[PDB]
């Protein structure tokens, strides 16, 4: 806890996935994933920056079949966060994109995927 | 005998009711008379049914205000009560923080014709 006179702080890392790996490493990972699972979408789902009433997700990486709509994914987040009904949340795709719950993620992927090939989503409460 | 002629007002977006040349011309006149104001087109999101249509779609906004000011203005014209939540989307689906200055949104998202297009929708949609 103290090394060489220095007092070390051990707080856990809250990095977004994009800040933990390099662009080359993320691209490399997507290609491996799209090779073994060409019928699934690699989705990164993280907590919005300024969120306060909502807890962090324990698992933020999801391999999703092409055919499921956003509803099917929202309810997954509904189950993983185990939220109460009076606490409403929204899911933004990529950077600030509100998309219809009936849209298949396969169209969302090809329209909104990141430069690295991942599809980034964030959940928030309001504002 | 003859024809059944039907006349109904248009609910088509502003971009389809006004030519490109007229829209460009209108912004040019407005930026000349009002160089410190932002011309914003605010319309109801296409598949929206919970919130009504507004009688005014064209808004001349001071360039110094934040997105918050535009939300409060639309909320008032929609006469919403606190239990009614809505979003104001830039372009078609872009969510922006209410603290973002409208001038920054304008220079980043304005249309080629000089207007800034926004739509309002409720969480249901």
Backbone φ/ψ region at B114: left (φ over 0), alpha (ψ -120 to 50), beta = left
Query: Which residues on adjacent β-strands are paired with residue A47?
Result: A123
Asked if A97 and B95 come within 8 Å (Cβ–Cβ), the reply is yes
Strands A119-124, A40-47: pairing is parallel
Using the CB atoms, write b or e for A80-98: b if 16+ within 10 Å. Answer: ebebeeeeebbbbbbeebb
Strands B86-90, B37-44: pairing is unpaired
Contacts of A99 in chain B (CB under 8 A): 93
Helix, coil or strand: residue B102: helix
Asked if B123 and A96 come within 8 Å (Cβ–Cβ), the reply is no
Nearest to A98 among B85, B87, B98 (CB): B87
Quick check: B87 contacting A, CB < 8 Å?
Answer: yes
The Cα-based distances of B95 to B4, B26, B29, B86, B103 in angstroms read 45, 27, 29, 12, 16
Rounded to the nearest angstrom, the minimum Cα separation between B57 and chain A is 22
- Please give the resolution of this entry in Å, rounded to 1 decimal: 1.9
Rounded to the nearest angstrom, the minimum Cα separation between A96 and chain B is 5
Helix, coil or strand: residue A75: helix
Interface test with A, best of B46, B94, B124 (most A CBs within 10 A): B94
The reply to whether CATH 3.40.50.2000 applies to domain B15-122 is: no
Asked if A97 and B96 come within 8 Å (Cβ–Cβ), the reply is no
Round to the nearest angstrom and report the end-to-end CA distance of chain B.
45
Which top CATH class is A18-124? Answer: alpha beta
Quick check: B71 contacting A, CB < 8 Å?
Answer: no
Helix, coil or strand: residue A98: coil
Strands B116-122, B37-44: pairing is parallel
Nearest to B95 among A88, A98, A100 (CB): A98
The Cα-based distances of B35 to A34, A82, B28 in angstroms read 51, 51, 10
Rounded to the nearest angstrom, the minimum Cα separation between B87 and chain A is 9
Which two three-digit tokens encode residue B16? 């389809």
Count of Cβ atoms closer than 10 Å to residue B117 Cβ: 19
Quick check: B108 contacting A, CB < 8 Å?
Answer: no
Quick check: A59 contacting B, CB < 8 Å?
Answer: no
């Amino acid at each position: 806890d103290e090394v060489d006179g220095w007092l070390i702080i051990d707080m856990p890392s809250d990095r977004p996935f994009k800040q933990r790996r390099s662009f080359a490493d993320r691209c490399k990972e997507v290609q491996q994933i799209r090779d073994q699972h060409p019928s699934k979408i690699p989705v990164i789902i993280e907590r919005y920056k300024g969120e306060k009433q909502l807890p962090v997700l324990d698992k933020t990486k999801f391999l999703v079949p092409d055919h499921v709509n956003m509803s099917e994914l929202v309810k997954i987040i509904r189950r993983r966060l185990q939220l109460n009904p009076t606490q409403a949340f929204f899911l933004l795709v990529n950077q600030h994109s509100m998309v219809s719950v009936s849209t298949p993620i396969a169209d969302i992927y090809e329209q909104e995927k990141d430069e690295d090939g991942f599809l980034y989503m964030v959940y928030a409460s309001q504002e």
